[PDB]
Amino acid sequence: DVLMTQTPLSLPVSLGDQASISCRSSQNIVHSXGYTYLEWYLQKPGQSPKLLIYTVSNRFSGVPDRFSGSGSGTDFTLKISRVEAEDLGVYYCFRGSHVPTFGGGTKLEIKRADAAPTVSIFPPSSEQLTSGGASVVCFLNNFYPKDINVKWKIDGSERQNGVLNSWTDQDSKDSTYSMSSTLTLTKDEYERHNSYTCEATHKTSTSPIVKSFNRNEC
């Protein structure tokens, strides 16, 4: 159907660099008249989306000349020169004609040197056990880029049910990302197994980072 495909989903850049966000319509965006209704909106954390560019290349009042847009037919582009700190957030193209539709969005992020995650695995606390629950926490902190995957192994056997994941937003201090993975079981199932393993796969290594412990050992 006439969707709005926006790419890329994540656009990391160095402040001062130029950023280009693309948007392609599955059909030629008609003409609302001579104007072509394709807008660019920016949404910063905890805020409402805000108008950047309308009718493909017209800059909304108050918007810096650093932002400019262009394109025609099915391909449109938002160009941001000298990206600055306050420009970080999520951009959305929008087809305002016929069937109004938003693009998937593009997160303008900071680029930095790759960094391998520091992985920390923790067995259930005796307090949680006292109550009959069993959570095994694993942290994968300060890694770059954002892409990563976690796999849990209970006695060398992969486990994927009962796993809860969460990711922080880029760290405003070292520009890294961090993830938190929690495998939750019942005390009984947890006490029926000995080996607990958390293992991270990140581009910074051809081999996965493995953290683990055995319930018996203390």
Binding site: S32, Y35, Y37, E39, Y41, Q43, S48, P49, K50, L51, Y54, T55, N58, F60, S61, V90, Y92, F94, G96, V99, P100, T101, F102, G103, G104, G105, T118, S120, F122, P123, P124, S125, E127, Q128, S131, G133, S135, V137, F139, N141, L164, N165, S166, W167, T168, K173, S178, S180, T182, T184, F213, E217, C218
Partner: protein
């Protein structure tokens, strides 16, 4: 100035209905289309529909017909959206915005948004567990697990907030109507356990505050 003030936060049960308002001031309410955009936690903007206050004409996205009901009160320059058969997927922030034409052709003014949560959970305090290193380097990672609470939010600090850097408090995850989250903190191994490290979790809704001092797992 054009202004759009939206009704406040709402908690609703599945199957029920909710009605939020978008009060307009600063312009000729009956001359512009009012649009409604939906945003799910961490997700992208999604066009719901629009209504022209001048004659109540409405146009809805195929995905929302039967879900969103748009009305408008001329007398009070207020637009309304009513959602039916609420489900968990309706939980989201809902924005209203006026689409201008003339000086600009786009949604130039947006409301602050109305956060709607759909849940059958009742206030539940969180269980807090300490995450401490199991076996006896230079840097040490500690943490706390805040599990099974409702509703959001929860505040986590370390050493009453005096311990700020090296801290990662993760976004909560919804699992079977309840929320779970964690917070890690990495410090110099010459600081722990010689110096104290405590996480302070507070949960306003349930009038609860919990402190866990991290201690080695001897």
């Amino acid at each position: 100035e054009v202004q759009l003030q939206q009704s406040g936060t709402v908690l609703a049960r599945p199957g029920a209905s909710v009605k939020m308002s978008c009060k307009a001031s600063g312009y000729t309410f009956t001359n512009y289309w009012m649009h409604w955009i939906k945003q799910r936690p961490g997700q992208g903007l999604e066009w719901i529909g629009t209504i022209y206050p001048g004659n109540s004409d409405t146009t809805y996205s195929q995905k929302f017909k039967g879900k969103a009901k748009l009305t408008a009160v001329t007398s009070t320059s207020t637009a309304y959206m009513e959602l039916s058969s609420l489900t968990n997927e309706d939980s989201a922030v809902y924005y209203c915005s006026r689409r201008n034409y003339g000086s600009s052709y786009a949604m130039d003014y947006w409301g602050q948004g109305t956060s709607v949560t759909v849940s059958s959970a009742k206030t539940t305090p969180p269980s807090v567990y300490p995450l401490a290193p199991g076996s006896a380097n230079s840097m040490v990672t500690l943490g706390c697990l805040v599990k099974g609470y409702f509703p959001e939010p929860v505040t986590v600090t370390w050493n009453s907030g005096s311990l700020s850097s090296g801290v990662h408090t993760f976004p909560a995850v919804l699992q079977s109507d309840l929320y779970t989250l964690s917070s890690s903190v990495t410090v110099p191994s010459s600081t722990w356990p010689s110096e104290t490290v405590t996480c302070n979790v507070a949960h306003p809704a349930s009038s609860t505050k919990v402190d866990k001092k991290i201690v080695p797992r001897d």
